[PDB]
Amino acid sequence: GNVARVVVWEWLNEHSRWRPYTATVCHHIENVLKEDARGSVVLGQVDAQLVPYIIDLQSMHQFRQDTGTMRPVRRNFYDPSSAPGKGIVWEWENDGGAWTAYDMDICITIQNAYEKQHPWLDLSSLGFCYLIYFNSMSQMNRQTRRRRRLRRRLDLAYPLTVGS
Ligand SMILES: Nc1ncnc2c1ncn2[C@@H]1O[C@H](COP(=O)(O)OP(=O)(O)O)[C@@H](O)[C@H]1O
């Protein structure tokens, strides 16, 4: 009953980047974890688009049914004052019109810049040649100058638990 933190389940992708599940999915994973620490989260029950994937809480891996391949997952934690504590989410648009949430650490940084009335934010130190402009609400590649739309939604807060 001492410290409060935000649960963010993340999965490791081909670019060695920890990608976050949505808040809807993270609440579902936690609900399964509370019941049995050796359980298996059928992501298809909460998200029909994640129907091939299974989260094996024993080995802490994302399991593919049809192929058998695995990707490491993790139950990561962030400050309750950050964006996942409330459900603030920053997403960018690809060529096809689909919106994709930033990495959780970058997403929090964007929200920190925004609320401080920072005109823009530079992710070069973070390992991203990208520049985010809040006035135009757009992202720009520092090297290629290519731009993409930016948006911020109020989705669902990520699960919040207590550290003793
Ligand atoms: N939990 C997830 N949520 C959304 N997309 C995912 C997830 N896990 C994997 N992907 C996407 O699936 C693609 C790779 O397919 P994957 O299911 O990992 O099998 P394999 O790596 O054997 O091709 C990656 O580009 C990744 O972006």
Author numbering: 20 to 183
Reproduce, without paraphrasing, sentences from the article in which this PDB structure was first reported.
Six of these WWE domain-containing proteins also contain domains with E3 ubiquitin ligase activity. Here, we present novel crystal structures of the HUWE1, TRIP12, and DTX1 WWE domains in complex with PAR building blocks and their analogs, thus enabling a comprehensive analysis of the PAR binding site structural diversity. A highly conserved feature in all determined structures is the recognition and therefore the interactions involving the adenine ring of the ligands.
We solved two crystal structures of DTX1 in complex with ADP, with each structure having one ADP molecule bound to either of the two WWE domains. Our efforts to obtain a DTX1 co-crystal structure with both WWE domains bound to ADP were unsuccessful despite having excess ADP in our crystallization setups. While the core structural elements appear to be conserved, some loop shifts are observed in both structures, with most differences occurring when ADP is bound to the WWE2 domain as compared to the unbound WWE1 domain in the DTX1-WWE2-ADP structure. The observed differences are in the loops that interact with the phosphate groups and may reduce the surface area of the ligand-binding site in the unbound WWE1 domain of the DTX1-WWE2-ADP structure, which therefore might discourage binding in the second site. This would, however, not be the case in the DTX1-WWE1-ADP structure, as only small conformational differences are observed. Comparing our DTX1-WWE1-ADP and DTX1-WWE2-ADP co-crystal structures with the RNF146-iso-ADPr structure revealed that the residues at the corresponding distal ribose-phosphate moeities binding sites in DTX1 WWE domains may not support high affinity binding to iso-ADPr. Specifically, neither Trp30 nor Trp111 would allow for a direct hydrogen bond to the distal ribose oxygen, while residues in the loop regions (30–38 in WWE1 and 111–122 in WWE2) would not contribute to high affinity binding to the distal phosphate group. Our biophysical data, however, supports DTX1 preference for iso-ADPr over ADPr, which may indicate a mechanism where it recognizes PAR via both iso-ADPr and ADP moieties.
